[PDB]
Design a protein around this ligand. Structure first.
Ligand SMILES: [Co+2]
Ligand SMILES: [Co+2]
Lengths: 385, 385
């Protein structure tokens, strides 16, 4: 019964053996004669080794696109490099940016696209001083499936001088196009691919367990997507170069980041916030943490709205029994290679209380589906210990 | 394994008690000071009686939007009226068009938005002479759920002087925004509401029965949507002012017209083409016809890819038995009030052969999932007689 609005203008170009689409789509979206800035991480090493670089260069030649290269993106993209990109755009009369890589290259490209067309300081857009109203325009070649910035309206940039991270969220940030080829999955190492599967399922699950009502169709779409991740994830884990398996998983990621299927329901970020503190202290991959934390949060919140738990486990795991369902969900994680206890990762109870306080910050509780105070979070951590 | 591209830039505004969104979204999308053309069918009778008109006028006042009204839209929108709208736009310096109504008002508005910004003849865009490259911009208040032109890139206009219907399909035709309120369903008469439910399910079904492979996730999304139509349609038919029921059905229509869930699969238009000829000769509502024709086509094509039929009936009707499944599908139609035989509608076999020839036109077969020659179509009509 919750009203909602939905919009996503990013053109999705899904599939393989279609590298000509790069220059074709640059022409569709660049203003007059294309002259583009090629943006990537470090000096190309990864994308060059994977053969993506030579493929991009050949699509640019095949359409007579003049291009300048700006490398140097760092996993947490720096305003230092953004500022440099604005200059190169203004001086060299760049018409369009092509981000080749992942969330760091994409977000760097988004902030360069913002400043290139602006007569002030781009950090005003990130620090709530000004509201951007235009962007040069970017396209993305996605190399590693992640949080979906290739179709989001958010850019996250860190100012290393003040050591301050800021976000700019606005419609103009939507990439004009996003090339998605499942083949980029083939080379991701097993552990990180298992983690990324958990991230897709975590992202849907956080929207599913909701106190919103009248979401029958939304429920079914989210169930259908979660079920695919549960069925195909283990198959992909054992057959890494299977195109069908990678397509299903990467289209499920897309469908999860898109939110047409999640429209009209309130998400809960408790497990994400608790996991964040584990990762902030220990070297734990996000997906590995969510596989550990989410079953524990499910057990602790099983009494809030038991019927929505019964529906989830009936629709996704064909069982109305919550405890058997939870065990099935835990077996599914173990089938991707992930150990389920924090102690398995050498994490002891030592910092549970500190983790809970950090997650809580200046509030007494965290969560929406269930409000969690300090001891509640410690109890969830003990369930996962 | 089929590559695909997807894009839809129309902003969806879903829900009720949100008529302020009309003028708010006009301001977001109109170029500088808004001055809009209010477009509708006839002289407003329907939308005025429903109370939609007074609601639009009050949202325009609440945001100081100056507006001119152009009525006169006819169920098959006429270039006559389009041309008139281009003039009013150019003379009166209109910045934005607000279509209040259904597919006819929307398509008329789309062609006026095209010509208002062009220095030539708009019919060049419909007659393959020129490719439109801009539009003034329109927003839609949808009054009757239908084929989804409120989020399509197509406009269908008839030139009554040459009696020629033409279509212009292009990205600029996408409405800037589309207000969708389930409450507009409450007043639709029973027969037409049953037909419209069948149309949503027909639209998904035509994309589902495909010889494309590697569509596991797409299958599941389409199943989930079809299942909702099967479950909630009968409930809505018996509880016409239930907001939850109308929301599920109208969001399923949206999800069906959007095609993110159908991406990467080939549709079959055989039943649509056969039904078209029945409607061309008899006074038969499209949805009523598809409820009669689609089970007959299913029976006739049951041997092409029986496994995809087994999956459809298992996932949507919980049965692996095709014949029992088909009967369940036929019972579902009868539960919306629809009789299933052509003879029930006084349609005899008299024009079966003529209908088949018209549907075939200059080709020997029709269909993709199964190629159907003349006698095949007569056999399908006899199954439905
Ligand atoms: Co998360
Ligand atoms: Co149809």
């Amino acid at each position: 019964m919750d009203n909602f609005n939905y919009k996503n203008d990013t053109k999705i170009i899904f599939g393989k053996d279609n590298y000509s689409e790069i220059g074709k789509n640059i022409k569709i979206f660049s203003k007059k004669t294309p002259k583009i800035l090629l943006h990537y991480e470090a000096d190309g090493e990864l994308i060059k080794k994977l053969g993506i670089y030579e493929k991009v260069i050949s699509s640019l030649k095949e359409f007579d696109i003049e291009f300048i290269e700006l490398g140097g993106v760092v996993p947490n993209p720096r305003l230092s490099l953004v500022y440099e990109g604005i200059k190169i755009c203004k001086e060299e009369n760049i018409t369009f940016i092509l981000a080749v890589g992942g969330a760091s290259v994409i977000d760097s490209a988004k902030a360069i696209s913002l400043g290139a067309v602006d007569n002030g300081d781009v950090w005003d857009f990130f620090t709530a001083k000004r509201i951007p109203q235009d962007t040069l325009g970017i396209g993305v070649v996605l190399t590693i499936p992640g949080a979906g910035s290739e179709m989001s309206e958010s850019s996250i940039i860190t100012d290393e001088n003040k050591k301050q991270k800021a976000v700019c969220d606005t419609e103009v940030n939507f990439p004009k196009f996003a090339i998605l080829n499942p083949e980029v999955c083939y080379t991701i190492p097993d552990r990180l691919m298992a983690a990324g599967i958990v991230d897709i399922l975590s992202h849907l699950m956080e929207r599913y367990f909701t106190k919103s009502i009248d979401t029958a169709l939304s429920d079914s779409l989210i169930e259908a997507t979660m079920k695919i991740v549960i069925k195909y994830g283990p198959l992909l884990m054992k057959d890494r170069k299977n195109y069908n398996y990678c397509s299903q998983i990467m289209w499920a990621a897309t469908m999860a980041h898109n939110g047409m299927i999640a429209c009209g329901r309130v998400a809960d970020w408790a497990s994400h916030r608790i996991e964040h503190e584990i990762s902030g202290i220990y070297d734990l991959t996000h997906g590995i943490g969510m596989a550990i934390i989410f079953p524990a949060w499910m057990k602790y919140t099983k009494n809030i709205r038991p019927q929505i738990f019964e529906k989830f486990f009936k629709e996704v795991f064909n069982t109305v029994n919550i405890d058997e369902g939870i065990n099935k969900l835990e077996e599914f994680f173990k089938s991707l290679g992930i150990n389920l206890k924090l102690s398995d990762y050498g994490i002891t109870e030592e910092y549970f209380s500190l983790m809970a306080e950090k997650a809580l910050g200046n509030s007494e509780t965290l969560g929406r589906f269930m409000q969690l105070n300090k001891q509640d979070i410690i109890n969830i951590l003990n369930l996962a210990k």
